[PDB]
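Objective 1.3, modelling of assemblies. Example input:
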Amino acid sequence: DVVTYNTLIDGLAKAGRLEEALQLFQEMKEKGVKPDVVTYNTLIDGLAKAGRLEEALQLFQEMKEKGVKPDVVTYNTLIDGLAKAGRLEEALQLFQEMKEKGVKPDVVTYNTLIDGLAKAGRLEEALQLFQEMKEKGVKPDVVTYNTLIDGLAKAGRLEEALQLFQEMKEKGVKP
Amino acid sequence: DVVTYNTLIDGLAKAGRLEEALQLFQEMKEKGVKPDVVTYNTLIDGLAKAGRLEEALQLFQEMKEKGVKPDVVTYNTLIDGLAKAGRLEEALQLFQEMKEKGVKPDVVTYNTLIDGLAKAGRLEEALQLFQEMKEKGVKPDVVTYNTLIDGLAKAGRLEEALQLFQEMKEKGVKP
Amino acid sequence: DVVTYNTLIDGLAKAGRLEEALQLFQEMKEKGVKPDVVTYNTLIDGLAKAGRLEEALQLFQEMKEKGVKPDVVTYNTLIDGLAKAGRLEEALQLFQEMKEKGVKPDVVTYNTLIDGLAKAGRLEEALQLFQEMKEKGVKPDVVTYNTLIDGLAKAGRLEEALQLFQEMKEKGVKP
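Predicted structure (tokens):
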């Protein structure tokens, strides 16, 4: 039943043994044992960690078609694989979708996007999101702060970098 | 006579009306109408279902002193209340006693113990009992298999989990 | 004469030697020595005890045709063989006939019927008869009480079972 399969698939995915995990996945479906949320999340996360981001994205679509519901970890893993691969438009698109589904962004969500964006010259959108992060009562950190600070410094914007630096120390975030 | 009392006590215990069932029990003894095996089993099972496992255990002792004989249901109910309360040493002790009395463990007996043990890290004893279960010609199932499989997976022992998984499918036990 | 025959037939029937008892019966008739009430009752009771309830019923009919009168023992034996064989409609029919003949039901009559009925789900008729039993000034007992109590308990009707239980103890009938 789903519990036998989920435990094996989850253990194999943790060990990086994704070919076996995916095979048990396929086997599960064939026996008419129904994959659920946690089946999907474990596979997606294993594929994304292993560079196999196209297959992680297909499973995510398949998950949505079967009426199995994505959650903040689904979204965060995908958004993070996409952001790390330079695939920022698609990472932003999933961020907007997560919000339309009423699944709520958290600080891990904001940082990967801010960071990916600060990699392109997309500093104004990086800052816009940093702003948004706060107003949705989500709370920053050293990683967040440094990429903004490095972004702004790189772009000539020393005054605003120095100013985020002071804000950072007031918030108790350790430079 | 014992039949009037056993029927009322049994019906009250089934309805969860254990205070009344125990009162009729006490009344029975006072009139010198003798409680028997089935008097005891019904009370014990009702107490154990209702969380009242200390009183179930006292009745079980009382039963043994009065020369009324415990059987596999007595033992299974107790062992199962104990195992579900974390009280594994005492559950194991009753399992050994059941065997010394020549009352024979069955698949329900083995599963609760395997399961309780797989909850502690007691996976080797879980497996030892699973082994024993087979050699005394007692026959496993999905519940049995899954807790072992989940136990082994939790403990890094993926190869043995996968291997029980295949054994499970050969035996016609449906994952 | 009838006294020679009745004594032998009665003694043979008591010893279970029903083939010989029936043969002497037949012999009696052939000599034009007239069977009477007690001839019939002894045969019927022997046949009914020996499982030969169809022949007991035929003799009973024959008895009625010859103008020999059935009495409460005739009726009770038949009603009891019928009730014990599951043949409850016919047992009830003889009970009604006994009453129309002005032969009066007693506590043995009521118990077998109550009991047979409580075997089918016929608990309301069991209770109706228990009621009737009392109003015709016929007096209950442990057997009566227990089958009612067990009947009611089996049928979810714990409150009424417990209530008959208390009634039982007030009447001095020992549970």
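The CA atoms of residues 141 and 173 of chain B lie 6 Å apart.
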